[PDB]
Amino acid sequence: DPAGKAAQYHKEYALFRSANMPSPDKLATGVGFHSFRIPAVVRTNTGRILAFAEGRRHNNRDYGDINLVYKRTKSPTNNGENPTDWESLREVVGTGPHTWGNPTPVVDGNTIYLFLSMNDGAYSQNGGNTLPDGTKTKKIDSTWVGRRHLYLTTSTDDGDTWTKPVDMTKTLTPDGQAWDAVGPGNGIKLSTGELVIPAQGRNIIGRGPSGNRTWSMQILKGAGSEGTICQTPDGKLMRNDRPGPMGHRSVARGTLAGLGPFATDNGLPDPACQGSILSYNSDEPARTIFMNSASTDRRTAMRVRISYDKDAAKFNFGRELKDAPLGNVGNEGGYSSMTKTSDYKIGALVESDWYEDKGGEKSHRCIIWRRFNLSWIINGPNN
Ligand SMILES: O=C(O)[C@@]1(O)C[C@H](O)[C@@H](O)[C@H]([C@H](O)[C@H](O)CO)O1
């Protein structure tokens, strides 16, 4: 890989700063957030970078009052290089005491589509969880009020503003389903122009002229809840999903006509956590980038890898992110999202956990923004 001859570049700093950190991220209304989790990042066709997250208002839990927040780079050309290159925190949607989350964006010409999940504020995945008013949640169920919804919002002004989210659950989530997830992380635009958004048990396929899409479900057998999608260099689709049990990623391949079986990929250990994947380039040699925690049991083993295979069958060892660690962000590791930047870097959002209450709800979570070039990956000491 000729990119391995270039000087290695990496830079890293916190982008979503939890309430306990200096200069914590707050909305202009003064609403702050205990934790930020569940990153998503895209480069728009202007070069601007849009970074999304869940702003978890009172604690780090997945339920309760959670708003879908974002930042953009201040210009289309600054590539997110420095902290001051990013705008202040904004909100896509925060209505009610509800959970709004699972940001799953895809760029489509001059429109950015953002899928997201939602649940009523009185419900959680497991039920019985304590809320700030002293009540306990109900368990997410198959009722309209109690089941996870799927929403879509759009921007046609480079992320500056977002349309009121539209509930797509009735057409883009299977009937009878209770829990659900879209992404989180990103969707893609295929070489043939369709949009593909990964979701629990299914892909969501957008067809139509750029910026005027209509969506349908591609139901999958054996897919995970938190999936990634990526058109590999051979032109095929690949789902690379978070497994149910800890162990390894679960991967399937196919086309818009259907995917083959999901199988455990023993080359990609995973602790049952979200991962991210990115088609980096089409020219020679074509590359797919993958990021996750490369450990069957912990989220603190973040690793970024390259595959040169046309089907992304094999990834290299790659680079452990801890080689370029940050010391004032807690313990890095968790969900991630990657984009290419205009200046030939990979930009990655990565969760980090201050862990002050260990795994309890009071531990503050923040999100790191990393940029690095291919050479940094290729030249890793164990690669
Ligand atoms: O960090 C996790 O592990 C998390 O809890 C965070 C997400 O907000 C949540 O929606 C998702 C879900 O619980 C699993 O995918 C099982 O359905 O996972």
Q: Which residues contact 60 (CB under 8 A, 6 or more apart)?
A: 34, 35, 37, 361, 362, 363, 364, 365
Tokens encoding 290:
């993958």
Could you list the beta-strand ranges (E) of 256-299. 258-259, 263-270, 276-281, 287-293
Residue 137's DSSP bridge partners are none
CA 337 to chain centre: 4
Distance CA 67, CA 73 (A): 20
Q: Is the CB of 226 under 6 A from ligand 1?
A: yes
Select from 153, 89, 154, 70 the least CA-distant residue to 118. Answer: 153
Contact of 68 with 45, CB cutoff 8 Å: no
Identify whether the C-beta of residue 223 lies closer than 8 Å to the C-beta of residue 239. Answer: yes
Range of the domain at 45: 1-383
The full length of the chain comes to 383
Q: Is residue 331 within 6 Å of ligand 1 at its C-beta?
A: no
Rounded CA separation 354/223 (Å): 32
Sign for the pseudo-dihedral over CA of 230, 294, 100, 67:
negative
The structural domain count of the chain equals: 1
Cα of 215 to ligand 1 centre, how many Å? 25
Q: Which atom of ligand 1 is nearest to the CA of 225?
A: 15
Please choose, from the candidates 325, 370, 326, 333, the residue with its C-alpha nearest in 3D space to the C-alpha of residue 355: 333
Please tell me if the CB atom of residue 246 comes closer than 6 angstroms to any atom of ligand 1. no
Q: Give the alpha-carbon dihedral of 249, 255, 258, 259, to 10 degrees.
A: -20
Resolution, angstroms, 1 dp: 1.0
| Structural tokens at position 330 | 């807690």
Report which protein residue has its CA nearest ligand 1's atom 16.
225
Which residues share a beta bridge with 15?
none
**Distances in whole angstroms, Cα of residue 108 to Cα of each of 171, 195, 230, 252:** 21, 8, 15, 25
CA distance 337 to 119: 23
Ligand 1 atom, smallest distance to 125 CA: 13
CA-based R_g, the chain, Å: 19
Using the atom order of ligand 1, give the atom closest to the CA of residue 38: 8
Q: What are the tokens at 273? A: 């956590």
Across the strands, what pairs with 351? 367
Looking at the DSSP bridge assignments, the partners of residue 196 are 188, 205
